[PDB]
Design an enzyme around this catalytic site. Structure first.
Site: not given
Ligand code: AGS
Ligand code: AGS
Lengths: 318, 318
Positions: A152, A179
């Site tokens: 984004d 992550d």
């Protein structure tokens, strides 16, 4: 449109050339000149690399990495953040020391477009035309060659330089790292669904919306939600309780019409371009190939724009 | 099935009662007894809280939080990690100090099922039946009352105690926190797509797969991919080059048949239960309501299982 012009091809080989000549990166070889901006997990500094004498950008992410995974994570940083595109910022290398992961990059002397927006007030359409091309091409590259991601794009993720180049930041490293740490074990395992491993939950569509929004932001000179009413418009543009909190903005985004460019003051094709990006139903929203052939982009691609002169003048480079 | 039995209702009110009686949490009021396990961003310790004399679990996440957002992040931690369910671990509070976010929780004395798996070798079916109910109910609650998330449940995310309770950990705090930091600004903004704000990219389906896989893992006593061939089976179960790397496991998961329980040694309904969970096409995979009425769960719900005695004996509590 898609493959590289030999000046591009040269600039790339030339960086890769230098990179291998830099040798091994460590902390006490860097001299901090100034702060370029703040990242999510830390700070990006302009630094000189003592040995090579190269100026770099060094992103410092304050984050503890267990010895057992210490490299392997890094192995993957190298793999994940080294690109070979004119539209992605150059990667020198990455290292760890004392609860700091360092990412060393090509220094872009023009800074990010969030800073440039502040210097300029508003970024003009023709300029954003060339920005669009660059973002579209960068995101194309990231998608073909690198990733299944939500990417984004915000103005703070777009870099420019005095050569007139426009490149995506190497952004979202902190999220990526956590992550990575979340998905590594002793022995090799994964509890991720098959669906999520071909990562098409993350279609290009979400990236596009964010880009759309960034474009309107830059063109009007403020974050565009809530839209500015006619009062603001005539004033900003020469006749073409307040601060909503976050739960409300989020519902506004889901439930209200998408923001859009003011009429008259911007060309129809630009207006249509961003409208395609902000179509609320991602099934109907433009994809990247669609945008590459959109009227706005076709026209922008042919325009000869003195990007580098605009920029230098705006931020006072020389 | 769904609402609370008065013993449950009491146990909850009783925790909430205590929590308000604990007062303000700070670091030098805690005495570290032992390490319970390692989290993604740090370590979970068993600690005694000097004032109240309460035993707690305290998760320490080593992570720098800019002063400008320092609270507001925390505001949201409180909001995000305080639940009111028998199937989610109790939340005392959360605080920050010196690059450490602390999360204080109800101490579960039985530990996580990854540790319990190591103590037991394998967890028996009837036991996993009661585990399933708990996970399904916990994930139901998280989904109704809290979140749009990938919640991928591993045995390390399932907690048990000597009362025979089974509760989800308050897991994935590090990912949540970095994401939170990634999505906060000065002024309130969001570049997230509408699609992503009603967060149905993240259907329950991915959670289910991971649960399925965790169940097979626990039932056979090892991470189940690559499946164990007939050699292993007869040996483990009394007649019912190697370590693949990560790129391969991931392709194996996408491209190979889903793992499954060995026949004969496990009831048909259990086998079917996990098969429903591991259907590779998430359109066809069971959802949570489906599982709550599945044969395995119906039978498990009626079985009287001496969960607490099994557990105490397995881990040697008393
Ligand atoms: N190579 C560079 N040259 C000049 N400025 C840079 C460079 N890279 C980053 N910056 C500046 O640092 C800011 C943050 O960098 P980003 O890569 O956008 O990080 P972020 O995605 O916000 O945080 P991360 O990567 O998750 S720690 C940008 O907005 C720029 O102002
Ligand atoms: N309340 C608790 N009681 C006893 N042990 C706990 C408790 N909470 C966590 N643990 C132990 O700590 C381990 C990690 O906790 P999790 O909540 O599973 O963290 P994680 O999701 O791995 O990492 P985070 O939250 O992103 S830092 C578990 O596997 C348990 O062994």
């Amino acid at each position: 449109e898609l493959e590289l012009d030999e000046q591009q091809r040269k600039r790339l080989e030339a960086f890769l050339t230098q990179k291998q000549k830099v040798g091994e990166l460590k902390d006490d070889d860097f001299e901090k000149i100034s702060e370029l901006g703040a990242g999510n997990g830390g700070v990006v500094f302009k630094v000189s690399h003592k040995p090579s004498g190269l100026v770099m950008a060094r992103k410092l992410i304050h984050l503890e990495i267990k010895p057992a995974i210490r490299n392997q994570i890094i192995r993957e940083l190298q793999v994940l953040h080294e690109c070979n595109s004119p539209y992605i910022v150059g990667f020198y290398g990455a290292f760890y020391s004392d609860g700091e992961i360092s990412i060393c990059m090509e220094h872009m002397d023009g800074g990010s477009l969030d800073q440039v927006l502040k210097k300029a007030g508003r970024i003009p359409e023709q300029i954003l035309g060339k920005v669009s091309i660059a973002v579209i091409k960068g995101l194309t590259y990231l998608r073909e060659k690198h990733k299944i991601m939500h990417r984004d794009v915000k103005p703070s993720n777009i870099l420019v330089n005095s050569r007139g180049e426009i490149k995506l930041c190497d952004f979202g490293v902190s999220g990526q790292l956590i992550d990575s740490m979340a998905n590594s074990f002793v022995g090799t395992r994964s509890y991720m669904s098959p669906e999520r491993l071909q990562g098409t939950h993350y279609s290009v569509q979400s990236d596009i919306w964010s880009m759309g929004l960034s474009l309107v932001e830059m063109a009007v000179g403020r974050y565009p939600i809530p839209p500015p009413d006619a009062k603001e418009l005539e004033l900003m543009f020469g006749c073409q309780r307040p601060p909503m909190a976050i739960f409300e903005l989020l519902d506004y985004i889901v439930n209200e019409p998408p923001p859009k460019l003011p009429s008259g003051v911007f060309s129809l094709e630009f207006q249509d371009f961003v409208n395609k990006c902000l179509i609320k139903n991602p099934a109907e929203r433009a994809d990247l190939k669609q945008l590459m052939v959109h009227a706005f982009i076709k026209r922008s691609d042919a325009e000869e724009v003195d990007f580098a002169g605009w920029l230098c003048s705006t931020i006072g480079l020389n």
